[PDB]
Amino acid sequence: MVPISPIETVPVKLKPGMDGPKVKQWPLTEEKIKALVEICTEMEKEGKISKIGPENPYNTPVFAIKKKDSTKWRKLVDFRELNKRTQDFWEVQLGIPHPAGLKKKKSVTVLDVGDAYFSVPLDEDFRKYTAFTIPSINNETPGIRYQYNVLPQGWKGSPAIFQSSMTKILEPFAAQNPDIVIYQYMDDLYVGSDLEIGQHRTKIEELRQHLLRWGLTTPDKKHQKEPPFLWMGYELHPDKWTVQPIVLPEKDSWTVNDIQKLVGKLNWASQIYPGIKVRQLSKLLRGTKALTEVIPLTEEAELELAENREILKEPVHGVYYDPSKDLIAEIQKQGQGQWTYQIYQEPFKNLKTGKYARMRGAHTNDVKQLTEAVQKITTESIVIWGKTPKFKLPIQKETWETWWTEYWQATWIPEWEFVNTPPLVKLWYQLEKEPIVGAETFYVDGAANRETKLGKAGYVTNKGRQKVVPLTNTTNQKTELQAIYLALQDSGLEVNIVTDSQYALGIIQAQPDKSESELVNQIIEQLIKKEKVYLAWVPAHKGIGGNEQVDKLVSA
Amino acid sequence: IETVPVKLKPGMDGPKVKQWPLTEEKIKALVEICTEMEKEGKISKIGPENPYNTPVFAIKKKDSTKWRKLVDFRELNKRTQDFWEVQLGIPHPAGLKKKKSVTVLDVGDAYFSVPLDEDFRKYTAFTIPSINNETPGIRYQYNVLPQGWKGSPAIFQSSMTKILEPFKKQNPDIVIYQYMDDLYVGSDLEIGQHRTKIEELRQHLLRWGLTEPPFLWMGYELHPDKWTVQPIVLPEKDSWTVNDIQKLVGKLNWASQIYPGIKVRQLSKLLRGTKALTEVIPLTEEAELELAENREILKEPVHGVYYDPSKDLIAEIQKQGQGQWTYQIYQEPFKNLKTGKYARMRGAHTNDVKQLTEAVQKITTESIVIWGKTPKFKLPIQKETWETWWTEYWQATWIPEWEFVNTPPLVKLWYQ
Ligand SMILES: CN(CC(=O)N1CCCc2ccccc21)Cc1nc(=O)c2ccccc2[nH]1
Numbered sequence A: 001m002v003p004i005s006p007i008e009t010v011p012v013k014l015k016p017g018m019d020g021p022k023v024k025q026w027p028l029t030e031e032k033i034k035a036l037v038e039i040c041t042e043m044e045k046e047g048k049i050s051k052i053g054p055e056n057p058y059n060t061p062v063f064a065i066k067k068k069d070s071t072k073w074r075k076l077v078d079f080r081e082l083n084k085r086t087q088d089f090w091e092v093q094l095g096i097p098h099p100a101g102l103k104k105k106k107s108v109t110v111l112d113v114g115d116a117y118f119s120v121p122l123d124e125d126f127r128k129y130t131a132f133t134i135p136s137i138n139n140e141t142p143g144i145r146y147q148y149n150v151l152p153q154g155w156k157g158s159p160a161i162f163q164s165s166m167t168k169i170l171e172p173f174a175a176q177n178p179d180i181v182i183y184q185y186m187d188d189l190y191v192g193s194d195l196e197i198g199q200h201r202t203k204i205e206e207l208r209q210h211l212l213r214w215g216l217t218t219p220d221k222k223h224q225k226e227p228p229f230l231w232m233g234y235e236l237h238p239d240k241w242t243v244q245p246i247v248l249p250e251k252d253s254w255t256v257n258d259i260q261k262l263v264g265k266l267n268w269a270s271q272i273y274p275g276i277k278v279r280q281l282s283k284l285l286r287g288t289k290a291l292t293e294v295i296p297l298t299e300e301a302e303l304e305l306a307e308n309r310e311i312l313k314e315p316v317h318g319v320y321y322d323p324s325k326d327l328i329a330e331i332q333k334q335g336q337g338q339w340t341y342q343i344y345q346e347p348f349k350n351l352k353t354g355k356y357a358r359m360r361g362a363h364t365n366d367v368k369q370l371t372e373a374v375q376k377i378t379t380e381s382i383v384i385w386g387k388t389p390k391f392k393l394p395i396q397k398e399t400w401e402t403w404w405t406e407y408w409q410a411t412w413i414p415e416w417e418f419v420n421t422p423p424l425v426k427l428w429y430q431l432e433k434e435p436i437v438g439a440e441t442f443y444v445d446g447a448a449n450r451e452t453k454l455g456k457a458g459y460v461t462n463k464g465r466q467k468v469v470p471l472t473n474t475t476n477q478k479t480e481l482q483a484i485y486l487a488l489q490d491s492g493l494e495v496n497i498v499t500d501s502q503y504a505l506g507i508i509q510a511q512p513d514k515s516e517s518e519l520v521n522q523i524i525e526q527l528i529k530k531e532k533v534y535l536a537w538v539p540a541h542k543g544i545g546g547n548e549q550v551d552k553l554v555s556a
Numbered sequence B: 001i002e003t004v005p006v007k008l009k010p011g012m013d014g015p016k017v018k019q020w021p022l023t024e025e026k027i028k029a030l031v032e033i034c035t036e037m038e039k040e041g042k043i044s045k046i047g048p049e050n051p052y053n054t055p056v057f058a059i060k061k062k063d064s065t066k067w068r069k070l071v072d073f074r075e076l077n078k079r080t081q082d083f084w085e086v087q088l089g090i091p092h093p094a095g096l097k098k099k100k101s102v103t104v105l106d107v108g109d110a111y112f113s114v115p116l117d118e119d120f121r122k123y124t125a126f127t128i129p130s131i132n133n134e135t136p137g138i139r140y141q142y143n144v145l146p147q148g149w150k151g152s153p154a155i156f157q158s159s160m161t162k163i164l165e166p167f168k169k170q171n172p173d174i175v176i177y178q179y180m181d182d183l184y185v186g187s188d189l190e191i192g193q194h195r196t197k198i199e200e201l202r203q204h205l206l207r208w209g210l211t212e213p214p215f216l217w218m219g220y221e222l223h224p225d226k227w228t229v230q231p232i233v234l235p236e237k238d239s240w241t242v243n244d245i246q247k248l249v250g251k252l253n254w255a256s257q258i259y260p261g262i263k264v265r266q267l268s269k270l271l272r273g274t275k276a277l278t279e280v281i282p283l284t285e286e287a288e289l290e291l292a293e294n295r296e297i298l299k300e301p302v303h304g305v306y307y308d309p310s311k312d313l314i315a316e317i318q319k320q321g322q323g324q325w326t327y328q329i330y331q332e333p334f335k336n337l338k339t340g341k342y343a344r345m346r347g348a349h350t351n352d353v354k355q356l357t358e359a360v361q362k363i364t365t366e367s368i369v370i371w372g373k374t375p376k377f378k379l380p381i382q383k384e385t386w387e388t389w390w391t392e393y394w395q396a397t398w399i400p401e402w403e404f405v406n407t408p409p410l411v412k413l414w415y416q
């Protein structure tokens, strides 16, 4: 006998105020019972479980399931109730690595830890909660009672305890072999290195030896699998990676189910295939909860789909990460609030790609969206590479300077350079800081009747120019924008506009280049045509002349 | 040496807060820092049976070359019992803000000599993340009073009061205040000798520590007596354009919410007619009187302005351009406890966010001095922009609460 180190036990508790499960055992067929007894008998021999006395009040149901075309049986314990009553654990398994952050390795070995799993003991005081009962043949004897001595499969705490135990075992080995890397995923260990295959196989053997001190077994005869690896929806090769193949179906009709597999496939593929667009396909889910419904496909989405398949025409691969080289990120504007990006080290070799979509809102502009996309990419890059990439952005340095100096909000983007690939992000208009000498002055106002929705908008000017227009189906806010629209419509290239509308000014000070409001969009189109616009605000009903006059004119 | 029993407020569990992504260098620094702390017994590795988590990051203090570990205890602090046991509280010293000079010391390392309650330690759990989740996060909890925890100064207060005890006796005129890991020392003394006195204080902590703190020698020099506030001021012009007058009337209308007797009529009456914005309007004698009366009014303080310790302090900040920022502190709208302005952000220019972050730190510092607590900020920045960058510029051991302003305020002009 070679003495083996015990694995340190994790203390486990039930949730506060909760007791263990008591759940009726389902009646089983005679053939099933025989199977479970056989299984539990060997499991008992192996030390995995133990028979218990009558005093344990707790019970969890056990099932036996039939693997198809066949005579052989598998044991299944339903832990759903015990899990509800089990305390929360730290789940280390939250984030998976992204291939783009992984490194090239000359050699990679995969070890199977399945047998090592059951050498992980369960907390002594918690075992009583795992009690389960094998029904007797014809219910003529007391059923056989077992409890678990080890982490049961399907229990809430098994994965976190298992991985944390394995990690603690691996720590000294990894620390004293910095020239190799080890990652644990489910039942597997991935051990890579840059050592030549001879020295590598040695270190693996040393690793097998190390796990043996806790009595742990890794399979000798090599698993028959070789690169590519299929892992978490990816394809992994020694020098490159990509997503598992994406095939976009041909269909005469598309339902909400059809498109959701499609958005998933597309979103998933978007991390590698450059220039994927989901907006229009996503657009068909707006406020619609019926799952079986077949929605007619707009032509605008057809073009989008056809654009996708053309991008999907052939396989595309990402490379792995080289720490010695810089990280670059480049962004392109696709239109309709869509943004796409590539992250790379060397030209025409991407680590990964992705897209960004405009947040929902009444008004927006390209500079804000570009800024948002940069923050997102910044965060994603910290996660994956632990650093911020240098940015290549389709916006002129002067544009950015003009934007952030005059913008009311604090804003920032990290180190970046201009790349000239149209379309370029630009400022469409900028308002004047001071009133304009020689420009005509337009005092505008609008008003509406809350009951009749009848209203008026117009202006009076210093040159005696005047207009008032009657409106139907409108509001105070709408009339206030229309007034401003009219003044823009009727003035020269340079104009001073006076309004009492806090609503309008709030919109314009946000500098939207595009809006959900048709009226705001028309105002923007007018602003763009102007050489100079100065917009002044005054408080209403203060007897401000020409504001007072036009207020009276529009309130009649 | 014997722990003081600590519990959470009723009906609420410990913090579970996602660790945000960290740069490689901050990760390495934390690994290095936590490794030593572990050898000092200050922290211990924890298992999966601890669900709780609090975010951690690393910063560099003012004028320092070495990383410091900062934990964000904001969630834990909300959930920890108010420690009212021995004292309801210190009445906040009012004399601290009236001092010519106040110096801020990091005493926080003193906390590490006092063990933390065994039952409470699990709640201090924090995670050092790995790049790309390639290795499991390194999980620790605190064995001793952590820096940034609201229970640390409260517990250690006993020890602290005895340490300073010999000091207040020979210097009864010195106001000393403690907030979190910081010690605030005021005096009316001249600077040069005041500075040396500060040096004296450091020696007290050394001798008791060995019976060496990484941050203790530093100090932050303040002059609250010299802090400037912002009364409402109106232009004095020989020539008033229509535009000038519109802005004035606009400014007076806004002030009228704050000040009762403000009149715009005789000024508003000048606006009679439809006129070019740049046209010069002569002031009528009625208007000049009204403008002059409004000045007198604006010279007096706001009426019915008081601080209520039962309510939150709210701080608003406006970006005025050219590195200038304005801020107001109030519990109640139009009643301002403090207003101020900052042009000086140091080597911060090309970065608005860095300027804002420094602004937030100064405003909180002033708020700690005046009321003994932190204001809730309303920040003129998009959430995703702030949340991305603020940890990069953050130099303080505490952190305040903040919310975001998405709609540009009209009033920015009035504080201009
Ligand atoms: C080509 N590449 C990846 C690879 O072959 N596998 C193999 C199996 C799937 C997988 C999952 C996560 C991480 C790596 C891998 C090599 C590699 N690169 C790494 O950076 C790495 C780090 C820790 C452990 C194994 C590793 N292996």
Ligand SMILES: CN(CC(=O)N1CCCc2ccccc21)Cc1nc(=O)c2ccccc2[nH]1
Residues within 6 Å of the ligand: A406, A429, A430, A431, A432, A433, A508, A509, A511, A534, A535, A536, A537, A538, B243, B246, B247, B250, B413
């Ligand atoms: C329009 N506004 C400032 C502003 O929003 N600007 C003016 C400065 C640059 C700019 C660029 C893009 C969009 C807007 C802007 C000018 C203004 N001018 C005023 O005289 C005024 C008087 C009372 C109240 C508000 C006022 N506002």
